[PDB]
């Protein structure tokens, strides 16, 4: 169906669970024949990424990097990179499990990868959140 490539530098959450959430999200989104990479790393690595790609010298929870190259119908969507370190702190602050936070961050990252951004606010945030909520509902059910 889709090719989900999961790479873990940090390993508190099972690889197969991350793979399954990602596959279920892609399926809820109706996508077929695409490639998605998910990387679970630490605060130091995500910080270098944030600095290099967003000019923000600090750690964060998730970053998404679009690629987009196509090979006869197969399309590479790109990468979602999540910091376990930050995810753990947020999970602590929000009162839920690390798994729940990682799952939510995967969905958040995928929606960004499809070209929605909530930071604008207004209509875009509206559409971003409706899509994210829909996907989450599909992973709950």
Curated annotation (Swiss-Prot):
Its cofactor is Zn(2+). It holds the Pfam family YbeY. InterPro entries: MetalPrtase_cat_dom_sf_prd, YbeY, YbeY_CS. Single strand-specific metallo-endoribonuclease involved in late-stage 70S ribosome quality control and in maturation of the 3' terminus of the 16S rRNA. GO terms for molecular function: metalloendopeptidase activity; RNA endonuclease activity; zinc ion binding. Keywords: Cytoplasm, Endonuclease, Hydrolase, Metal-binding, Nuclease, Ribosome biogenesis, rRNA processing, Zinc. Its main location: cytoplasm. The lineage of its organism: Bacteria, Pseudomonadati, Aquificota, Aquificia, Aquificales. Belongs to the endoribonuclease YbeY family. One of its GO terms (cellular component) is cytoplasm. This is Endoribonuclease YbeY. Its EC number is 3.1.-.-. NCBIfam families: rRNA maturation RNase YbeY (TIGR00043). Binds 1 zinc ion. SUPFAM superfamilies: Metalloproteases ('zincins'), catalytic domain. One of its GO terms (biological process) is rRNA processing. Zn(2+) binds at residues 108, 112, 118. It is found in: Cytoplasm. Disulfide bonds: none annotated.
